[PDB]
């Protein structure tokens, strides 16, 4: 019953191909609810979940104002960072930012987040105190000094402990039938001979929400961590997720192996075997 809200910003320069693109997306847990793309024919914040549609024009206008402003500021920031790293005007570079709030099952703030990266590398992060910064390198220390000078951390703390939590709680109520519903995985084991003396057992989890899940194989009751192939959790496109874990076993030993599934949607964790 814990919940989070996150915004994810991507700003990408593209010398010779116009001004840098800014994209913002917002999520509650594993559900996206808004987007903004400065490359759109008519850039505006758009709904991406049915429960946000009820927000009034003032909401959409305020969001759009914010993201249109951010489009311009992140363009300047990309120029600034290019300078901080003595980089050529010829290369494409990316700033990413992720920020938001985490609530525990009581609805209370657990912690806030605000982190940035440059070309995929940590650049600067707001510490858990919501009051101080961790800069990755001497360029980021320049940003730290600018942000210390401008009282940015104080404003982000006020947001994170205030509006962030308030709006997240509003979304959770408006979207309660989906955001506050855990869909358990549907699970089964398949068997695929690979040779005369070995076979693959693949443990499947399908149709689950949220994305967090644990799938493990045991042999004789011992986790088979080093010998398990585990694919990345993947979206089905209907809000739910899919995952599998596989192990190659000696033929005739299949019943020594058990698949174990943990998911919020399960009252009791599951143990499965191949059923021939």
């Amino acid at each position: 019953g814990s919940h989070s809200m996150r915004y994810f910003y991507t700003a990408m320069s593209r010398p010779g191909r116009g001004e840098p693109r800014f994209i913002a997306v917002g999520y509650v847990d594993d559900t996206q609810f808004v987007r903004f793309d400065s490359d759109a024919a008519s850039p505006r914040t758009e709904p991406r979940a049915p429960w946000i549609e009820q927000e009034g024009p003032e909401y959409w206008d305020r969001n759009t104002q914010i993201f249109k402003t951010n489009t311009q500021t992140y363009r300047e920031s990309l120029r600034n960072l290019r300078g901080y790293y003595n980089q050529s005007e010829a290369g494409s570079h990316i700033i990413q930012r992720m920020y938001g709030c985490d609530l525990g099952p009581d609805g209370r703030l657990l912690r806030g987040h605000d982190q940035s990266a440059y070309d995929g590398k940590d650049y600067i992060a707001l510490n858990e105190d919501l009051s101080s910064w961790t800069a990755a390198d001497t360029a980021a220390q320049i940003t730290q000094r600018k942000w210390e000078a401008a009282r940015v951390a104080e404003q982000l703390r006020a947001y994170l402990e205030g509006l962030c939590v308030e709006w997240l709680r509003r979304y959770l109520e408006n979207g309660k039938e989906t955001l506050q519903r855990a869909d358990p995985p549907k699970t089964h084991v398949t068997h695929h001979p690979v040779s005369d003396h070995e076979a693959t057992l693949r443990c499947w989890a399908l149709g689950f929400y949220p994305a967090e899940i644990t799938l493990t194989w045991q042999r004789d009751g011992e986790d088979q961590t080093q010998d398990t192939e585990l694919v990345e959790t993947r979206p089905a496109g209907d809000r739910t997720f899919q995952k599998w874990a596989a192990v190659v076993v000696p033929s005739g030993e299949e019943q020594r192996y058990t698949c174990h599934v943990q998911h919020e949607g399960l009252p009791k964790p599951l143990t499965l075997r191949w059923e021939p």
């Binding site: 991507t10 997306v25 990316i94 993947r234 496109g237």
Partner: protein, 99 residues
């Protein structure tokens, strides 16, 4: 530093021949964000494909879902072709309904 995409090709629902479904190509773990993805049917690019809005994981790598309606048959072959700056040539991953 650049990161090359992971690629999974799979259906939304269990594949049943002659029953409409969605064909997914999920690309993840890549950096930078520019990426070309096409879904193929017997080697031919499928025309009307949609995709998710750009977002990224805790490690800053990007992910995107590309998807289209499809009706699997016994004989039709599906695949995802991905190009990215980390790749010397486009990578083709075939749809296997057991994966």
């Amino acid at each position: 530093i650049q990161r090359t995409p992971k690629i999974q090709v799979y259906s939304r629902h269990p594949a049943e021949n002659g029953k409409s479904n969605f064909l997914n190509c999920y690309v993840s773990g890549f950096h930078p964000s520019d990426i070309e993805v096409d879904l193929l049917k017997n080697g031919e690019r499928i025309e009307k494909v949609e995709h998710s809005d750009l977002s990224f994981s805790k490690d800053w790598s990007f992910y995107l879902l590309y998807y289209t309606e499809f009706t699997p048959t016994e004989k039709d072959e599906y695949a995802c072709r991905v190009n990215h700056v980390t790749l010397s040539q486009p990578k083709i991953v075939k749809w296997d309904r057991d994966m």
